[PDB]
């Protein structure tokens, strides 16, 4: 009933490339959708230039997306070779505007944004989301907040009882 993504799942997507940028501790799910949007234009424009580079001779790449409470790693839809692997905690934000999924993790103030394309972009972001919390909640229960279940039957009775 939750074990689903602790093991993980895999979605077929399309990697377009990446783009590195600068962030500062704690921005905003509002200011992030911005940077995220400029991280997509970066690579879209980088792709048009990519295409053209092919005239002097398609340009994207097929990948699988492994999603879990542990990590989120991209692999070769063909060679099945890892192309990148980020432990979930190092991933801070993802978004699914249109069939374009973008996620950004800490490149180990210097973030790196990966840009993929998937007719399931929708479904895809949602999952990462659950992982985020499922992972989060675990990355919460282990800290003695065993009352993680309780802490929500608390973050509520700590809000109405706050009137």
């Amino acid at each position: 009933g939750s074990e689903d993504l602790i093991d993980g799942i895999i979605f077929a997507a399309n990697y377009l490339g990446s783009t590195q940028l600068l962030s500062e501790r704690n921005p905003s799910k509002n200011i992030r959708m911005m940077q995220a949007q400029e991280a997509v234009s970066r690579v879209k424009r980088m792709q048009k230039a990519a295409k053209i580079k092919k005239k002097a001779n398609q340009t994207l790449t097929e990948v699988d997306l492994f999603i879990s409470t542990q990590r989120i790693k991209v692999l070769n839809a063909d060679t099945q070779e890892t192309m990148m692997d980020h432990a979930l905690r190092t991933i801070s934000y993802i978004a699914d505007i249109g069939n374009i999924v973008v996620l950004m993790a800490r490149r180990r103030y210097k973030m790196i944004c990966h840009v993929f394309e998937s007719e399931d972009a929708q479904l895809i972001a949602q999952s990462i989301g659950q992982a985020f919390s499922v992972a989060y909640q675990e990355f919460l229960r282990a800290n003695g907040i065993n009352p993680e279940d309780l802490s929500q039957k608390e973050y509520s009775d700590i809000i109405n009882t706050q009137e």
Binding site: N26, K29, A36, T90, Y93, D96, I97, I128
Partner: peptide, 14 residues
């Protein structure tokens, strides 16, 4: 136009 943040990241991390 939906984006989610990692409670876990925006935690120990930042």
């Amino acid at each position: 136009q939906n984006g989610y943040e990692n409670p876990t990241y925006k935690f120990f991390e930042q």
